[PDB]
Ligand binder design. Structure first.
Ligand SMILES: [Mg+2]
Ligand SMILES: [Mg+2]
Ligand SMILES: [Mg+2]
Ligand SMILES: [Mg+2]
Ligand SMILES: [Mn+2]
Ligand SMILES: [Mn+2]
Ligand SMILES: [Mn+2]
Ligand SMILES: [Mn+2]
Ligand SMILES: [Mn+2]
Ligand SMILES: [Mn+2]
Ligand SMILES: [Mn+2]
Ligand SMILES: [Mn+2]
Lengths: 440, 440, 440, 440
């Protein structure tokens, strides 16, 4: 699966449709980023710039100009071609090939941007710009507007209105197209395959990072070179740390391991969590906590549909959790009183669901307390968990247990589709999978 | 292999030994670095801060104070402990545990640095600071010195002399200790194992990135989670691009593949290049170029020793190259005239050798044209290559061939030790290794 | 004459009337300005901040909030009272006295602005801000908007639209109210008195700066402590330099002296130029150039009225000038051809007229080539001049002559009113005035 | 009096003498400074740049290069000549005329500084630079050093040591040469003439600013165009505000007026304070406070000499003050106990003496509590005062009285010379002077 030329074109048009007449929108590429000294991290394009271009170079700027309600055109600034820079650091699109390759009307050298950008904004009424996203962008934009402001004797005028395009663009990204869902579907499959492999490879005596290596190799073999976020492999008490990425410990027989990992496929994020016994067999105490988290996930997957909200499903999860914990003697008292006192918060201290897309924690307005009514095309995670601290004042057998189970879904017309159900989560199925692998 | 507490202590003392009396040296940690939106790249500590601390947190500053020629002490600023930040993002050293863990006299909260740093520099004559390394550091340091400058009514005075410690510290890093060599030795072994595996797995129809996945998995299984630089896998004409990292192409029977990859083990970089046929059998034309590059490497490995230089060995390599190319009809004319006209430069257009250590392109003064006389403890690469452009005006059979062969060495008392010789480079040995694997 | 409380109130309301509902306008005070080391120049408030407040302290910000089409309110941030800062640097308004004194609804400490401003902008749709006017303002505003942008979990939202209020406010300042005209009328009288005094005091052997001292003393005695711009006193060849402020030369019998000087009365600028003989008697050559400049001024004063433009009157001046110069043999050829070739530009190389108000070069849109149709209430200068370079290739007697004559006017319903006609400009009247004084 | 070419040359050499061999010192000119919109304050050169050049243009940089202990040379960067910029804003030195006019070896265009400065610092060991003085300077200097740091392949190296030249240069400025003393002597005379005139012109009903106008006119007529600081004219209760510059009040019969004003002559500051009755006749209550302040001044003028300190003389002044106040019933108790409790501080709350030179609050180290031993050539103020608040709990007749009397002196071999004694300070002499004038 991939995103077509035509889809990138549609997105630009959909933004232009919402822009005021006599305006220009400016979307900047991400800077390169130092890892150490002269070496750089692998390049990651800005998600919003990527969304309208599918162009993976730095030092580029998309300018969409709306002259009026039926006339508009696109200008790309990008790096000029250069034999020496390309023998070294690899090929560039340049200006000649860009109009056709990327479907833009004009392409200009990024090195000429300060000489050209103000001429493009001259006489417009509005400029859409994401101020404070990048410093190099703010410098370029403020420098253009100052030229126009001070150039009234050269008959130049600046647009007096500056509008943030992020709310508009993030509201667009919140609703996935059929193509986007097809890509995210494959990101979910790739990620599931990686998690199944981690379960099948796990043995006591391996280190947490060994499972990270297995996962990343699986991402890569399907053409997802990078993860969408830093992989979490928290065995034992490390599973009580929500974003544990040290992954430095020897995995011990008797412990659970919590794996939170997701690939990045064509820009889009997978995001799955699975928790399982290192030795392939859940203890009674481990099952008791795991069952509460699994019921939470399974109930949420039933409930999520158009018309409800993350807040409303979260409330049901809290009920399931508080009731389960009371039955184990981890909480004491009346369920409804405990719910009203948020007595689950020491054990479940994060949100159930976030938007998913070009970023793992994707853009889009949630509403107060995540009360926004869900609609078809919204893509989100379902990620209940329970984390009992090593020093919690609860029965000994629950102390130092961290369990999360997380799936990725898309809201459909009548309910939801689970993108990550191809990796098992029922305990009996986890155990069968690990036994099968240990034979072979 | 690892670096001991005592070794970190020795390094600090070695720097303090060179500092003026009545001075303080300020060494800042690296900032966290955004990959996209709220997600961050895996943290990489500043190599110089790492060198004196082996401490892998951001928002930390080492202050070494030399009161006089026998009195000095160390102060660490680091992140305070915090239960909520640690349930989320994982554990912190804090101030209580830091003196013992890191061998410093005092530890203070990074959040108090602007209230404390000027009190530490008050009345000193010199401050050692790497100006322009990090903006957040320059702001902290300039803000401290301004307080002191303007506080003469509170009996405060600023050191009038600011010295860059980088030349001193980089001259220290240039000469590896026995422990550093032991670590780099293991980085070389780990990297060699990865390159052997890539050769053994390569088949036509696999993609360049598939070999990247194999390599990274091998790094990880030996406890080197990250590469020291972005992995290069350039098959066919892609091998003519020196830092090709797209690794996006299907590998074709008939083509060579150039793999440039290195692990990062305990901070230290491996750096190996091997070029081999995708189908396991070099053609006559491929052998003809490969043999020139291999002779270049083998001769350089014989020559490198105390007393010579990168420049002097490079001159021998150029002779070997120009002579080989003339014999193939790729160059025409008198060898010595061609050498004097640098007629190899269209085909070999980079340096033979760089320093290697905590950075792949390691710190240390090279001298003019890399004429610095080599001494025991210097660690460096030997990396001859020949790159014939797809459109070079040479016999057809050499066009689009990129070959590099690179090993890592340390200068010893009587010659050099090859850290990366455990992966094969003689063509007959490459071919045997790939045939053996293809059986199985 | 002065500006009333009620007038400041009217101005704010007139701006609020034009603002969108659910918006806030932010108007910042000028920073203090170093002259040398710890000493500062006399404080000059930002003209726009002054316009809405008549408040002459630094570190102040006016926030006008339009909740909707009938509800709005004002908030002032200003310096808190402080006994020690006031024993030293003199009295402050503070927060208690500000609402009544300045007619604002609320007053808050400037030192709390970063804690309060974002709460004032929370949930608004638009913010009016003059971006790039002051750096300290941009930092305050961007810091507030970032808090709101990132505070969606605390139910905060930033206005997505930022609008420059300068075009609106400068269009307001362009049309003077009856009170403003009364003040500018007195600024013109004060300035005229100063220029008359300079003529009456001038003797050969005095220095240019001596006339500057006379002028400034006259400004001050009428309660205009500061000039509106740096005083020009260019005798002889110095009169060929348009903004000559060195005023360092001995004034010579035989030379003309050009005095360009203006007071600042209650914020408003006077701006007069008079040129006269140092010895009180114009030569034939001096009269010949002076008469052309005077006819230019006198014709322009007849012509300026609603319905015409600076461009249209400038064209008449150019005709008068080119014709006069041709008659003197300073230009050669056909008048209309010379006009079409802009042959006056070596001698008259600046505009005839600029807007006048709180700034000497006052705000307001001129239109292309200053073609904007004039309307009652516009206040402007009329300032023709001719400058013949010491090395111009013209008859010897005109070389090194600089003459400008400048008056300040306001456009009325049927023509214009001359605010600066109380200082003489007809040569016979200049000469009588200087003879009378010499007796003283 | 003026400062010779030779003296500027001597100063540069005296600095070069103290510089390390293989170093360059960088001294930047002051920026132009906005008063409002496009209008600028009168230009004031940086005192340190002025000290070595007597050059009064912006955008200039003096580079003094010490190659070794007998070889050094000077380079000026300054504005290029330009006919259009000079017809408008007046003449420029340029590069051709600068070597001779300013006694420098080479002059280069300021517009080429980023292309040339790094070539001047290449290969030096030390750079003397006043970091944080001006932002435009820090940008220029850091940009040069970065070029050198990163240009090792072009055989460039940066000086690793940066030293603040301000301590050295300010220690030079602290000791005035015979020429400097001659100029400061004339600044004292000019300032005294102005203060005598203010006394002679004062009548009840005049405003405070009227005396400011008289003073400034007197400065100007002697060729001191600008004051060295903003003039203070505090009548009545305004005299209790130390730096009262509003000067807005009608002067009332019965009140004292405190005038603090100083001219700037050839860069050097006069600084005199005189307090006198508005109506020409001191009351008993006014005399009682005035006599304490005058005894303080007269005793200090006797005491100041090489070997003592500002601290030591201040202690004598405090004794005189506490004793006087006790006799008036303004303080109660034992003199020595009151002195030990600093019981004078409500009434005398500033220092007695500051250094005087190119800045009114001149550069130079004071020592702890101003304990530095005085030496011939030091120039300083002597400025005791007593300020009784309108609401002080003291006998009614002393409330709202502000009196300061300040003279400028230079330490000589055997004592001091009073530069400002030509304006009267004994009350009987003040009264005679005002009576004489009233006849005018
Ligand atoms: Mg347990
Ligand atoms: Mg071929
Ligand atoms: Mg003449
Ligand atoms: Mg009284
Ligand atoms: Mn997750
Ligand atoms: Mn998630
Ligand atoms: Mn390599
Ligand atoms: Mn290498
Ligand atoms: Mn004028
Ligand atoms: Mn004017
Ligand atoms: Mn004073
Ligand atoms: Mn003083």
């Amino acid at each position: 699966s991939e995103i077509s030329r035509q889809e990138f074109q549609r997105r630009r048009q959909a933004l232009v449709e919402q822009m005021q007449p006599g305006s220009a929108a400016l979307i900047f590429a991400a800077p390169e980023v130092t890892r150490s000294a002269d070496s750089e991290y692998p390049y990651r394009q800005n998600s919003d710039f990527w969304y309208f271009t599918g162009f993976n170079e730095p030092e580029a700027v998309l300018v969409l100009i709306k002259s009026d309600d039926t006339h508009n055109h696109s200008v790309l600034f990008n790096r000029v071609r250069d034999l020496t820079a390309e023998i070294w650091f690899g090929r560039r699109l340049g200006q000649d090939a860009a109009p056709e390759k990327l479907g833009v009307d004009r392409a200009l050298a990024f090195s000429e941007i300060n000489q050209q950008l103000y001429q493009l904004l001259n006489g417009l009424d509005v400029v859409y710009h994401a101020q404070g996203e990048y410093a190099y962008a703010d410098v370029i934009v403020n420098s253009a507007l100052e030229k126009l402001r001070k150039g009234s004797r050269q008959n130049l005028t600046a647009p007096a209105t500056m509008i943030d395009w992020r709310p508009v663009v993030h509201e667009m990204r919140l609703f996935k197209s059929p193509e986007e869902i097809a890509v995210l579907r494959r990101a979910g499959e790739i990620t599931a395959m990686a998690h199944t492999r981690a379960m099948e490879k796990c043995r006591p005596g391996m280190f947490e990072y060994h499972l990270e290596g297995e996962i990343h190799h699986e991402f890569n073999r399907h053409g997802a070179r990078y993860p969408s976020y830093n992989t979490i492999v928290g065995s034992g008490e490390n599973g009580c740390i929500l974003h544990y990425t040290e992954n430095e410990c020897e995995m011990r027989d008797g412990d659970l391991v919590l794996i939170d990992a997701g690939c990045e496929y064509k820009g889009y994020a997978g995001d799955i969590t699975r928790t399982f016994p290192v030795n392939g067999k859940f203890t009674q105490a481990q099952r008791e906590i795991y069952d509460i988290v699994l019921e939470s996930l399974e109930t949420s997957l039933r409930l999520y549909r158009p018309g409800t909200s993350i807040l409303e499903v979260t409330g049901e999860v809290v009920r399931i959790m508080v009731s389960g914990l009371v039955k184990l003697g981890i909480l004491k008292g009346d369920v409804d009183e405990l719910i009203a006192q948020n007595a689950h918060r020491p054990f479940f201290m994060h949100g159930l669901s976030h938007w998913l897309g070009l970023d793992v924690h994707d853009v889009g307005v949630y509403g107060q307390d995540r009360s926004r009514i869900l609609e078809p095309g919204m893509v989100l995670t379902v990620a209940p968990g329970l984390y009992i601290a090593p020093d919690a004042e609860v029965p000994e057998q629950y102390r130092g247990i961290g369990i999360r189970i997380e799936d990725d879904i898309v809201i459909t017309e009548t309910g939801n589709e689970n993108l990550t159900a191809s990796v098992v989560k029922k305990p009996e199925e986890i155990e069968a999978l690990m036994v099968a692998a240990r034979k072979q």
